[PDB]
Design a protein around this nucleic acid. Structure first.
Length: 60
RNA sequence: AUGUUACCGCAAUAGUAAUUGAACUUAGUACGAGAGGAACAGUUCAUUCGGAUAAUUGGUUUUUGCGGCUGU
């Protein structure tokens, strides 16, 4: 037995509207705030899940 | 050389001031019926020039530093 696996959070997500005053922010949306294409800097430490958010700032 | 000496300086003046390209994005938009297709900005490397440099890479002279070879 095998099934196609689509989680309920996928179906429960609203479709992104490209012309919308009230919508989800994309990466370009946060990107265009401080500078533009090349000069924007990616943050990885903020996003990933940990048991403590202070451990996001901590250093391996 | 202008008493000497020493340091810190100023500047009359002399010369000197980097070449060329493409990678994102601005863009698949302005534009164009389409075909297709920008650029100012903002980032990234390359070529060439100039000046330095030995951390490393590599070459090179003086090694006669260590170990070893081949004799006459």
């Amino acid at each position: 037995k095998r099934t196609p696996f689509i989680p309920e959070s996928v179906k429960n997500l609203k479709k992104y509207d490209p012309e919308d005053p009230n919508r989800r922010k994309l990466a370009r949306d946060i990107e265009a705030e401080n500078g533009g294409a090349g000069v924007f800097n990616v943050n990885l430490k903020d996003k990933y899940l940990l048991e403590d958010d202070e451990w996001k700032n901590d250093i391996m």
